[PDB]
Each structure stands twice: as C-alpha cells, then as structure tokens.
C-alpha cells in the first residue's frame, strides 16, 4: 500500500545515496593540481550588431560559423552576417512574445518558439525568394523555452508544463512525449551524437532522456534553485547547469555525481546562459550583474570578464570552430568577441 | 571601394534597415496594457465589456488610440518566470471583487497578498497600477446583514456603504512604498461604457507623466 511504496522509495534513495558516497574518492583539483593555468584573458569587442529595437531573448549560430539568427520581442527574427556586420533576412513574426530560436544544421530551416504554445517553422530556400511559414506545431499546454533541431525533418522542444516532446515536421504530429519533471523546464541541449539530450527543470533538477525509447536515464539533484541554461561539454559526456543562486554546476554521466561548483562571495546574481569552447577549457556564463564571465573549466578560478553590456545578458553562443563568441543582452545590441 | 557585387548586398541591408525603422515607428504608437486579477475577480465582465491556450491579446481603439490588452491569466505555471516579458507596459489593470466575505483563506486576504507581491516587484517600480473595484452592488447588499469586522478585526467604525468602501480603498492603496508610480482607483458593477473612458484618462495621465520625466522637467 502507501506505506510499502514509501518504504520502497526511501530504501531506493538511501541505496543511491550510499552508492554515490562510496563511489567518490577524491576531488578533481587533486588530479588537476599540475595543470597549468590560462592567465588573464583580454577579449575586446570586434563587431556591434545594432539592428534590433527591443530586448533580445535568444540567438543561435549557423553551421558554417558565419550566419547568425537573433530573436527579440520587437517582433522580428532577423538573420545576420557576422563577418561583415551585415543583414541577409528579416522575418516578421506572428506573436512578439519570443523566448527561443533555432537554426537547422543544414541551414535550410529555422524555428521560433514563444509564449503561445506554438513552435512555428520557417523556410529559407523558397523559389519565390521570400521566407514563409511551412508548418506550425501546437501540442503543448504551457510555454516553450528551447527548441533544437535533430535534422531537417524532426525537432525537439521543451515547454513550461513539465513535458518535453519530439516532433516530426513532415506530418506535423507529436511522435514521442517525455515526462517525469515536477516543475517548468527552461533549457535543452542536444548531444553531439544526436542520440540523447538533457533538460533542466525549474524544481532544481536535471534529467537525461534518449530519443529512441523515451525513458529517463539518470537524474542529478544536488543543486539549490531553478536551472536556467544547460550545454554539453564538447566530449559529449558532461554538461554545465546555470541556476539562479549565483552558482553553476558541472556534472558527469558515468560518474553520476556533481564534479565542481563555480562561485565567489561577491557574486550574488544568477546565471542566464552557459556555453563552452572547442577544447573544453573555457567555460562562459551570462550573469544578471550587467556583464559576462569567462570561467576556467578545470580550476574553477575566475579568469576573465567580458564586461561591456549595458543591461542583463540573456543569450550566449560560440561558433562551431571556436573562432568567435557572441552575446546579446536586454539592450538591442549584439557583440562579437575574440 | 574594394567591393565587387557586395555593393548589391549593402543595398538589401539598407532596404531592410529602413523597413525595420518604419515598422518600429508604426508599432511604437500603440499603448500596451496588462490585466491581472484572481479567481472570480470579475475581469471577464470587463474584458467582454470592451467592444471593437496562451495569451489572449485583445485589441480595440478609442479616441484614435491603439489599445492592446494582454490578458495572460490563462497560463498554468510558476508566475515569476515570465512577467519580465511584460516589462515596459504602460499600466496594469487590477480587478478586485468586493465580495470578500468568503473562503477558498479569506479571499480579500489573498487579493491583498497578491497586490502586495505584484506592487513591490523590482520590474514595476515605475509602472502605475490601475485598480478596479467590481461588484459594488453585491457588496452593498451584503453589508446590510454582515459587517466588515467579519473579515477585518482591526477595522473600527460604522457599517455603511461609503465608509466601508473608503476603508477598503485605503487598505489597497496604502500598500505601495515607491514614490514614483501612482495608483488609480475606480468602482463599477456591470455598468455602462464608463469602464473604457476611465482607462483612457489614466493612460493619458501616465503618458503625460512619462513625457515630463523624459524631458527632464519632472
């Protein structure tokens, strides 16, 4: 009955806790005590993409590390050119309440989400020379927060109703649904192998699904507030979660434990975005104290600041070859750094 | 110049820059409003009184002023995650039902808690809040039998309509601590078109205040 189920749950949680305690032998600093530091990192802005008219909520790099998409609540979703601060497209949206955007790895399609349950998919290679809506996906009952393509034919979305779903664009239906979270989901990051992914919930947890069977694999609950952004390590065996309580974590799959926490006393704001670098040594983050922060990923030491933004940053991405990094804040400007 | 066939892309860039500029100018002339409330707060009566899943964006015009009422209560999640999308709105329509002699905790206690929460938020320091008091006839009818002390132990005085209404209005209005934003109050009960002109007057007053503050004259 209820007592038996409670006892089983308590026994399972105690066994998991004991196994996790036993598996831990030493911290990561001891193994990385002989690792050379990186030193001060002086990065200056190279381009300032002054095109928007409101606060920017999302951006996503292209596939050839040149084209760029920015989505903002001014009502537009315009595709940029990073090498020459040039504009190539301007897509007027239906609902100006936009919190996410995506770029297909083939470059053919883009997808925008929003606060109206609908993840509309656009087309860029029409024969009439204009961008035009192809299909609208509407199966959620909350608000979408992140959408990442799998290929040109299927997409993955996460909405503020404790559900994450996979869609087949050819038909327009919802193929598989994911469930198990208790609060809103606000982040999603597809793995490099495109076989499984992670999703951080608002109830201070993160779970690992696979796109083949639809069942949760692991969960990592050691973190004290809602999670706002996740991204994998380039190896595809780790990911960093950025919450609102001034700290960001770094988890590992096979170790099945938290590895490191990155914080300082003076930091009191909350993370907003997380990315990495091509070699997986530099951790970037986006803070509410009106700036950015370059974080050493192996020493947990504050190792540079990308200050210069006038307001809170809300999006942060790096190119596919680690050549540049772009940031967009609640002021209409984007920036490029090297 | 060094540009070859790149001169044909700069023309496209400038064309769409002009398009964005004109679109922003045309879309900056509509006053945006937000509507809050609670369960059985009478906000349906006023949203259906305006005659032309997700956010039900209502649109209408009055005295050549483009209005946008972003009714959002339909969301089902933790609220605090998406209000900051609605920053830089011109005002907030807040509806309170004057039938606070019931429990769901006491309803007026819940309304006071919600108003205190949404009135001292970091985003709405300078955002004026329009306060509507609804169902005045029901409250006046009910106050004949039951007094106001059935819900407010601190209250002292008579059991008449005008004084009780003034006390309730003062209790709601004294909840703001910032000295920049102002609270506008009104009382209606399924009445005539008056529900829209009060909103228009409040919007004009807020725009005037914003212009004075922006010009630096304030």
């Amino acid at each position, epitope marked *: 009955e209820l007592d038996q189920l409670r006892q089983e749950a308590e026994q399972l949680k105690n066994q998991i806790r004991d196994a996790r305690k036993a598996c831990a032998d030493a911290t990561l600093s001891q193994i990385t005590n002989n690792i050379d530091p990186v030193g001060r990192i002086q990065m200056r802005t190279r381009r300032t993409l002054r095109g928007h008219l409101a606060k920017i909520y999302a951006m996503h790099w292209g596939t050839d590390s040149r084209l760029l998409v920015s989505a903002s609540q001014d009502g537009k979703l315009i595709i940029w050119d990073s090498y020459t601060t040039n504009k*190539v497209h301007a897509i007027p949206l239906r609902s100006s309440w936009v919190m996410t955007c995506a770029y297909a790895p083939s470059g053919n399609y883009v997808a925008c989400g929003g606060l109206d349950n609908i993840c509309s998919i656009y087309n860029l290679k029409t024969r009439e020379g204009n961008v035009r809506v192809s299909r609208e996906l509407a199966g959620h009952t909350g608000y979408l927060s992140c959408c990442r393509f799998l290929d040109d034919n299927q997409i993955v979305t996460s909405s503020g109703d404790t559900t994450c779903a996979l869609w087949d664009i050819e038909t327009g239906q919802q193929t598989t649904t994911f469930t198990g979270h208790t609060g809103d989901v606000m982040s999603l990051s597809l793995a490099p192998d495109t076989r499984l992914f992670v999703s951080g919930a608002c109830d201070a947890s993160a779970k690992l699904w696979d796109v083949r069977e639809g069942m949760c694999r692991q969960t990592f609950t050691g973190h004290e507030s809602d999670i706002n952004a996740i991204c994998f390590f380039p190896n595809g065996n780790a990911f960093a979660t950025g919450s609102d309580d001034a700290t960001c974590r770094l988890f590992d799959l096979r170790a099945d434990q938290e590895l490191m926490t990155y914080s300082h006393d003076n930091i009191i704001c909350g993370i907003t975005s997380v990315s990495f670098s091509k070699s997986g040594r530099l951790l970037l983050a986006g803070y509410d104290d009106f700036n950015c922060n370059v974080w050493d990923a192996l020493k947990a030491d504050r190792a540079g600041v990308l200050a210069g933004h006038d307001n809170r940053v809300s999006c942060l991405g790096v190119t596919d070859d680690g050549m540049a990094v772009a940031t967009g804040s609640w002021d209409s400007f984007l920036k490029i750094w090297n | 110049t060094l540009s070859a066939e790149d001169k044909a892309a700069v023309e496209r860039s400038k064309m769409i820059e002009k398009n964005l500029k004109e679109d922003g100018i045309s879309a900056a002339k509509d006053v945006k409003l937000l509507l809050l409330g609670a369960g059985e707060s009478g906000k349906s009566t006023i949203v259906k009184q305006m005659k032309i899943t997700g956010i039900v964006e209502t649109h209408f015009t009055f005295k050549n002023l483009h209005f946008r009422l972003f009714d959002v209560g339909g969301q089902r999640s933790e609220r605090k995650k998406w209000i900051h999308c609605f920053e830089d709105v011109t005002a907030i329509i807040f509806c309170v039902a004057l039938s606070g002699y019931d429990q769901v905790t006491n309803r007026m206690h819940e309304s006071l808690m919600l108003f205190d929460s949404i009135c001292n938020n970091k985003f709405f320091i300078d955002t004026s809040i329009i306060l509507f008091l609804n169902k005045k006839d029901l409250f006046g009818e009910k106050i004949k039998k039951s007094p106001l002390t059935i819900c407010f132990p601190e209250y002292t005085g008579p059991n008449t309509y005008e004084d009780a209404a003034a006390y309730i209005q003062a209790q709601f209005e004294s909840k703001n601590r910032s000295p920049n934003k102002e609270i506008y109050c009104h009382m209606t009960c399924a009445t005539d078109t008056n529900n829209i002109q009060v909103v228009f007057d409040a919007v004009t007053d807020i725009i005037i205040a914003n212009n004075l503050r922006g010009c630096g004259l304030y």
Partner: single-chain antibody
Amino acid sequence: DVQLVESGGGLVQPGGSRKLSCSASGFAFSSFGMHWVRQAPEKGLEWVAYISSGSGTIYYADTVKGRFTISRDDPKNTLFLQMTSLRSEDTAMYYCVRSIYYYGSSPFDFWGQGTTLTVSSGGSDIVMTQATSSVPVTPGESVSISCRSSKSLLHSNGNTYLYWFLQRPGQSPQLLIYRMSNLASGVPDRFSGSGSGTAFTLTISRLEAEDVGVYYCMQHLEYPLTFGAGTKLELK
C-alpha cells in the same frame, strides 16, 4: 511556378522607336533585379542593361548608353526598356533574367523566353575568349570545356565570379555553375566546375544525349558583363 514572357517585338523603320515589356509572374518580383541580354541571329550574347531592387543603381552597355533606358513597375510586376533610334546592328532578340543578390544567393537562376526584333537594312573592359565554337562529342564519355579570361577573377574576398551556362537548341539558356564552384538548383549532379584565376574548366561525366547545345561563360567582377563566343556540341 515561375514564368517569364516578353512581348513587343516585330519590325520597325530605321531610326524608329519601340517598347518592350518583360511580364513576370509566380515570384516576389519586387525583391529581385532584372537584366536584358540580347542575342544576334548567329553570334553569342551581349548584355544590354540592368536595374536592381528598388531601382537604386542602373548600369548600361557600352554601345547602348545614351539611347536606351530601362525601368520597372513592380506593383504591376512588369519590366520596361525604351529603345530609340534603332540601328541595323540591333536586329537581335532580347531576353530577361532573374538576379537576386545576397550572401549565398544564386544569380541568373531563371531565364525568359525571348522576343524577336528585326530591322530592315538602311579596350579597358574584361574580354573573355573561348577555344573553339565547334567541338563534336560522343555519348558515354567525359568531356571538358574551357573559357580563359583576360583579368584575374579571384577577388580579395576569396570568391571568384564566373558563371557557366547552357543553351539547348531553340530554347532559353540555363544556369549550371555559379561562382565557378557551386552547382545550381535543378541542374543534375553530373556537371562540375573548376579553375584558378584565369583558366577555368567545366567537367561533364557520363554524357547523355540531352546535353547538346552551346555553352557560354560569363564574368561578374565589374560591369559591364562580358560573354564568350560559345562552343557548339553535336551528336556523333
């Protein structure tokens, strides 16, 4: 569907004037750029005019500037070209093409039909030359073509501006390769492009019987735009 069709041809007395209209339908006309490419009865192609989107910049040929004018009315998706004081060397049919320009776009992706125009009798620009205008080929083998220019086409941007074409007998020309390396849309995965600086080649493998015609080469570095004499390919 995308459709281009031109009307206004016929005959006109020497020194006369006439109008020609390139009526288009099936695409966003107001966001494109239009050209005019005339063709002599036996010679190759010559570029005549140009007008960009919004009619911002207009270019002209060297034997045409001062006589003809080109204008478009995109609310009614129709192109215009006013020709005055005609000459006996203008007895050529005119064409009409599609020239969208942005990063990664493919210009000259469509070609009009062509309107006849007969009139009764009475140095610093880039020059591009081709090897021979008559080369017989056989099915089942791989053939190559060349078109050498006079000025290096590898711009400092890293791009090279050269466009290969194909003209089937009695029909409109088609786009095969743009920027000397990319393959256009709809054209099969059979053809291929190559070259470096001034010596360009186009490679065809497993040749069929549908690829007979004349191949033309074009530059797009700086205006005016110059073509080649072409190369005729015939069966057996």
